[PDB]
Design a protein around this ligand. Structure first.
Ligand SMILES: [Ca+2]
Ligand SMILES: [Ca+2]
Ligand SMILES: [Ca+2]
Ligand SMILES: [Ca+2]
Lengths: 230, 230, 230, 230
């Protein structure tokens, strides 16, 4: 099996689901007492936060790129970034370390395609919803049309993540706001909705939509196990 | 802070509490969005169990040692083995990688000695209660007298962990048995009791003892965080 | 005594306590060398889980119905399904085999009513807390008022069972969460609290509650023994 | 997967280890969430005992045979009798139901022969050590010579199983007796030793023998799981 290099700690709470699910998938596929071979570089989140606060994505890219190279030295054969948003620097990481990088958007696209879907709604941080790294990749690489909320609604979705969910605040009114945004996406004729942030799943679930939901973190973890065993 | 190198996957389920507790300690001490700097090498448990089943400690030590060396290449400055029985080859791993290794028995011995305790009761799997790597180390290295239950009670304790607690089964007769064994250790004049694995606390806790109880796993994770921050 | 037909293997770990407790109850009541007369059909959980994940309740019903008919052929006189959520198709299983089925929700309702309680708290998976087969059955069939946690707390309770407890992962923050949810239920005026699955006991127990706890699994086993002896 | 028909041991405590081990083996070999398909018939020992006391051994035998015929009706494809001593009626059961019976002695014999062994020492209840059903099968059917302890040692071995080991009592003097009996078998030139029941492993194990030891009950459960998967 391939040794997976995970870059996490952003936050450590959202890294645990990867570690759990990759291991569960490997055990299911191989049986015995098998678990995944994982080398996880868990950074101090504060360092990344200070960089984001200064808009210094260059240095943030360097920090995670260096983690990837360290994982390569340790024997990792592929890189898995355990956060949707930090894929903002995935191209930098991949170019820097020379290992394959299992991109979260590509893993989601696989499942979307498997369901025959060509038009999807997308929820996440503003970065994830607006920028080329995730939304642009679904479309330009995989030919999937992506619909996001309007600006006022993206502001609310984003604020709730950083302001509440990230701090462990799970609000009923925030849930109702997401429920409304979901209905608006569905009104645009989307065939499914991507929950493109681990924390979103703390607030809403499959019962809050009338179309298939895609939990990108869970899908990414499953994809990572599949890759290790391929 | 120092970068911690964790060797886990033995099993992965028991690695999660280490990762969680170490991060929680760092957040509590440093505040803000601080998390621990951790590089975790999670091995395939099937390989380790197979070697252990053959009594091939030499190869097992080599495998863990290679993991420790990998972590060193990635930047780890200290090694924490997130399991109890593999500590049988802790001194070999430490010598092989040239990094300090925070031994699970040593971390607990420090707490016991600081509290003035010189006679301790030990509960855990049969291996932990009988073998040299944990109990022998407390005595030979730290000068602490170790009392264990009698043969009948060790068998009962061990059976309950393997056949019940490990299966998620909580029996009220088994809880009573553990309570009785604790009282028996206390009647022998122990000044504290070590819980050698986390499974024990599914049945009993400090409320069941008149002497202090030492959760060796919890102490290990706390010692790791402390070392990283010193 | 009646021959009990147990349908288990969902999972096999969960079946062991039913088998043990029923036998213990019979021995306690009849004394001497008596044990229960049990015929157990233990299914392949993989088949059930796959059907459950696809929402194919019809086929799941057929599978368990065939198990029940098999037990009838072997001489069983009553059916006990050793799991909570498959009770979703209990009425279909009962009809298929023509034997009485001792429903997990009825057994607990009976204990609640005998203790003069008409307002109860309910903790369990989201299935159990939200669907008709258990929650709705307590209220509709037995006239018992059922209070469950709010949306947020239900998500947490459920996530913790699936993501942690089922894996043996005991998290103190999770323990704290359950303790708060219990106090919130009590604040609501519930006269007792049901633990819908044994996983909950891994984290919390009677000490954590100011009201009587109803372990629906233990109660189910007790009811099965009592019925056999009736 | 074949459906296994298990006939419970006189004590349900003796049956649970078969259910646990078979399931663990199937999960290990197949992965997923797979568990064994087992139909277990667990009798009320009182009923058997009462018939025997009355001197009606034929009806008592018919009762176990009846259990096997019932398992056939339920769809079992092979009979597995739990415990070595129970095999005293294995021949009767097999003749009565017409299903293949996976005999504890045959499962162990093929493992012994694979190791190139043709002379073994046998420890167990006096029944197991003296009667035809187990040892006779090893010698007559498989060509394995069987050495047993002398009469005084058989009495001791037997008493210790019934009076101590079945109750989980571990006596140092009993352990010493078993160790001596092992050396006496080794002195007779045995190439391996069979532990007739798993209770024996409470006193002695591989560390006490200078020849390979065979836990025939554990081997039996392993063989049952293996056969279900063929
Ligand atoms: Ca231990
Ligand atoms: Ca001393
Ligand atoms: Ca204490
Ligand atoms: Ca025997």
């Amino acid at each position: 099996m391939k040794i997976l290099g995970l870059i996490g700690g952003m936050s450590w709470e959202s890294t645990i689901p990867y570690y759990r699910m990759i291991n569960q998938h490997v055990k299911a596929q191989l049986g015995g007492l098998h678990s995944a071979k994982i080398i996880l570089y868990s950074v101090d989140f504060h360092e990344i936060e200070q960089l984001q606060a200064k808009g210094d994505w260059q240095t943030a890219a360097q920090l995670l790129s260096n983690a990837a190279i360290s994982l390569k030295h340790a024997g990792a054969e592929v890189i898995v970034v355990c956060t949707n948003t930090m894929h903002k620097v995935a191209d930098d990481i991949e170019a820097a370390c020379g290992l394959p990088l299992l991109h979260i958007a590509d893993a989601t696209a696989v499942q979307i395609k498997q369901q025959g879907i060509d038009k999807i709604g997308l929820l996440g941080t503003r970065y994830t919803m607006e920028q080329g790294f995730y939304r642009g990749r679904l479309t330009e690489k995989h030919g999937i049309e992506v619909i996001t909320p309007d600006d006022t609604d993206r502001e609310a979705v984003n604020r709730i993540i950083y302001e509440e969910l990230c701090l462990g605040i799970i609000s009923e009114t925030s849930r109702d706001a997401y429920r409304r945004v979901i209905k608006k996406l569905e009104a645009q004729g989307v065939q499914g909705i991507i929950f493109g942030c681990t924390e979103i799943t703390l607030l809403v679930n499959a019962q809050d939509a009338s179309v298939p939901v895609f939990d990108t973190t869970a899908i990414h973890a499953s994809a990572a196990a599949d890759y290790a065993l391929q």
